[PDB]
Design a protein around this nucleic acid. Sequence first.
RNA 1: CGUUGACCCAGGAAACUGGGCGGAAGUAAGGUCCAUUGCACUCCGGGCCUGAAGCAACGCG
Length: 93
Amino acid sequence: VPETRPNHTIYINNLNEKIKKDELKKSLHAIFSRFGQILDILVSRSLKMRGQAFVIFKEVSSATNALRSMQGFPFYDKPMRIQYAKTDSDIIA
RNA sequence: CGUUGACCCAGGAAACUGGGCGGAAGUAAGGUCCAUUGCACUCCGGGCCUGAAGCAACGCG
Ligand SMILES: NC(=O)CC[C@H](N)C(=O)O
Ligand SMILES: [Mg+2]
Ligand SMILES: [Mn+2]
Ligand SMILES: [Mn+2]
Ligand SMILES: [Mn+2]
Ligand code: NA
Ligand code: NA
Ligand code: NA
Ligand code: NA
Ligand code: NA
Ligand code: NA
Ligand code: NA
């Protein structure tokens, strides 16, 4: 059950795990700033959190258009799988 | 690690206190093998190899 309730934050997974934290954080900001003001991008390479990212948008509408537009797009040879986050991010909340 | 400073944040009328901020550390980060498709925000799976830096300057390790 993919989280479909619109939220300020999008959840991305199926990310290439071999990409370095900094390069990844930078590429996602590149890919997503078109859609609106990004407040932050949260990336971790721990066991639980690798292959995933959260990008936080100032406007929900930015999150939606970003989610809708980049869905499934090949990124480092892997299709991005995007949902909304299940719960608000901290700066948003 | 010391001294004398810079700048940011919290508090304070102020003096200043606490942190950001130094030998930090075999840490952060990185390469590879294995494992993992995972909703988090207080870092952080395992093996092998490698491996930094406070913001400035001097001094000392
Ligand atoms: N990391 C350190 O302690 C640096 C000390 C050195 N003497 C310097 O001024 O840079
Ligand atoms: Mg194999
Ligand atoms: Mn004050
Ligand atoms: Mn020592
Ligand atoms: Mn120095
Ligand atoms: Na203050
Ligand atoms: Na007072
Ligand atoms: Na300090
Ligand atoms: Na590493
Ligand atoms: Na690594
Ligand atoms: Na929290
Ligand atoms: Na490892």
